[PDB]
Amino acid sequence: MFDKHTHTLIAQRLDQAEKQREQIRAISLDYPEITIEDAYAVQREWVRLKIAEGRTLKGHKIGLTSKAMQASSQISEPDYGALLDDMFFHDGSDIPTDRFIVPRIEVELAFVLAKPLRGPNCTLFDVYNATDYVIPALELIDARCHNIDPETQRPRKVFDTISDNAANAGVILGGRPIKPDELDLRWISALMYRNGVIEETGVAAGVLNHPANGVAWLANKLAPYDVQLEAGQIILGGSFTRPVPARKGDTFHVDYGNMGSISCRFV
Amino acid sequence: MFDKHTHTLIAQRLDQAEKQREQIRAISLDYPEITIEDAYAVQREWVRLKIAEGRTLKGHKIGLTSKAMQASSQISEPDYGALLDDMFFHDGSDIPTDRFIVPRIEVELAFVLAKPLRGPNCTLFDVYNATDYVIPALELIDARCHNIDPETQRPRKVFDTISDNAANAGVILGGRPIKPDELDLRWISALMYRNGVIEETGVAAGVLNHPANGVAWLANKLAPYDVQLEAGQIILGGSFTRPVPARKGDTFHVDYGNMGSISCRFV
Amino acid sequence: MFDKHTHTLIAQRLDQAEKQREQIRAISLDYPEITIEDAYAVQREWVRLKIAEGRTLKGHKIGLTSKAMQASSQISEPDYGALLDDMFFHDGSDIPTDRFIVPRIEVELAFVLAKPLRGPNCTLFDVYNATDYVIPALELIDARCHNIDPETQRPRKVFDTISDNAANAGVILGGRPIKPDELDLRWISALMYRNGVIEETGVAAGVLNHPANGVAWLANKLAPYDVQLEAGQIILGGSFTRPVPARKGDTFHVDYGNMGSISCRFV
Amino acid sequence: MFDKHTHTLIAQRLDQAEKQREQIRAISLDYPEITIEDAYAVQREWVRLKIAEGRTLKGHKIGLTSKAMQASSQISEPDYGALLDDMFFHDGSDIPTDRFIVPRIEVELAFVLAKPLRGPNCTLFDVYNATDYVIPALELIDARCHNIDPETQRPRKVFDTISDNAANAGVILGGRPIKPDELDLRWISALMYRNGVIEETGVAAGVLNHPANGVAWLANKLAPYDVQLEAGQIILGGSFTRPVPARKGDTFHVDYGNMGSISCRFV
């Protein structure tokens, strides 16, 4: 494990990559001895830097939820990253494509907390008690590191993703807010349209068998750092679709059936 | 368009590939001038051979329904193949892995016809009127041609798949039979488990915007050949999930919610 | 009744049996005058030892919840055991078969407590008041004593099972969490699949007429020992199916209908 | 295979066994080379004799509808028997215990045919088309052959059960008649009470994955004998519970929830 100053240097390089919209070499290639603990330490430093610049923490996301993507990576559980205020775009918004590098859209559910959640021993049941509203949410993900020879599996890529604030870039909330007990969250389903054609469909149970499961897991991950999920935070639970590339000119419309819809346009 | 003898020659080679469980070189590589008309002519010949051997036509399938698949296959419409009696396995069956080469499982809805459907001008409404029951159905697909050839590493094409009876191999019907009008077919959703873990999820609208659409399209495609979809036939409308590889020892469970489930095990 | 030292030494022998995956002779054959209270004292010592090793108490289970199972065990009421943190597996997990001796799977409902339950005079209504959520739960049960005695061929007795922490080994929570008032718990039903075939089915009322009844009974049983069911504990109420053997390679899928599903694979 | 005369004489012996309520030696022990087809031939002769006496065929039952029951019977498919008019008792009837030898109660769904079903190629969909109503049904089963051989202690075999008209003795229809399309038959569930205590519970999908599947299977089994399922016949599809012994003084109550109940008392 590296000393903090190494984590800070890597964070500064990610920060410049984001600002210039120019990718850097995969962190795990430049730092072949990097550990998962180092990766989260890099993330923490970068988030710290971005908050010092004037951003505010608004929540978190859980990623790498599919067992398939978990299997091919160096780890055997999901990942997480921090959501900042400048990542949020309004339902129906024009999104500036130029701000991103290789943006892709994911289909998720978000949990808006009424009460804090703290580990250890946080459970699904604690999540239900603490959740004010569940609402559909799109995530816009991106990559500040190059991915060389993408067809060749390289498990240590997960360290890059984690360092790179779990690929965070954007969030679009929309549709129908519900109390968590209103209906069975496992069977919420969605159709993702891009430019008027369905590109992906999915069902929420594809996220960790229950789309709220990652929230409890996250609270438990954060506990050792003396961090909790705070009241008012928005927690994105994970995607039940493969991400779909967003290009300038694209319009997205994601239909969650009786849970409403979310739209945006890339300009 | 190749001569009658050449179609039969290709069909016999596909037939040998299936019987021996030994893939042949892509048809498009040995025959670079192959057209889509040729491909269907080859399929017809192979089906003729297999019926002459003692099999019976039980229905048809529609494939290449997604936008991802149509673009990558370089085609602007779906494909189709013929379903024979020996392709059908019972719900909950042991499936002999050794019978197949590279089997993969798809998640579909099947339409069981009470009345014939004939083109041209077959509509979605005709399909509703002619359908006795809709039932969940898994398709087991396979490939008798190499995906990447030993000699040149060149990829397999859409002509190869179509010639190869649209990748047909197996069908597993199960779950809950319904009249077409019982509920909105567009929103039927499914969770595909392999070995207890969700590998894919999907919603039926991902099949041509309405899972009955392919049935009408198919009747219209067959009209020129003086062929119709016959009463009693089972028509598989297309997959709302990417295919998932089946290996010896795998248990599949596909949960269609209020439409029931289908299971099998590869032995 | 035996002295405290004997309870401790029997518990140590069971602990070694579990650790080494090697069964010991039925305790009741070595100790012909063993009482039900002795059996619970052995259980308490074993739980104490495991907690001393760093384990944490997470809840309890109730067993022998059929009049038929009670008759076979020559007892007139259920039994209970303690659930420790290391017994819990995630929904969809690989379960290490080598960790167990003769594992079997049961189908249950779990009660997650928001408030403590203390005897005497704990009622069904107290259980409803104290329960935060009900969630489907599988129990993985095992046996550290021989069922058929190597020397005498005589069978294991209820004293052996109770001493052996009521056959406890594993727990798998999954599916849909509900408030106890959401629907009639009595009519929750389930299909247990092993390797894609239904091995057992059952309905929750098969557990003591109402799956919450065992929880009240348990609180009342524990009162004389100055023990109560604590807030945050998970209480498994009993199986509505006969247990089904788990072997290496087995995939389990348990379908509780509108209450969701739980799966796992033995590896 | 035995000659026709032997089938007749075995049937006469079973007929006397039933009349006298005195078991005979297991047929398979007297006839070690007995085949499944011999067993069905004995059954056919017995049915013929009973009809000659003035009885009328009212339908059929399907048995051994579990993979587990099939394994115990060393068979790879269900069995069947014929239901005669004098086997039917009214809901809430006193049942004369003295008429039977070792009676046991099973919990089933019955299919009342509006149209005939003939093999080969009878499907689930044909069953739905031909079924007028589905109604809960209890089966009273019995055994005219010793389970444990007086001389050798050897057990009864499947050939014995099939010869013995598939253990047929009584049928009790009751509860709520529904059109097959009214609800999902797979999820009909039941609680069997004997003397006010639940002895078994079960769900209809436990019968061959779908309680109508046995009906199609049966039509296909009967086709080679130039027999079909006739309009107006009642077909019992299989038990979703293990049979429960009936003794003089026993009251049975079987609760199918929203499908109604069936009761009887043994006197």
Ligand SMILES: [Mg+2]
């Ligand atoms: Mg995401």
Ligand SMILES: [Mg+2]
């Ligand atoms: Mg298909």
Ligand SMILES: [Mg+2]
């Ligand atoms: Mg249990």
Ligand SMILES: [Mg+2]
């Ligand atoms: Mg029966």
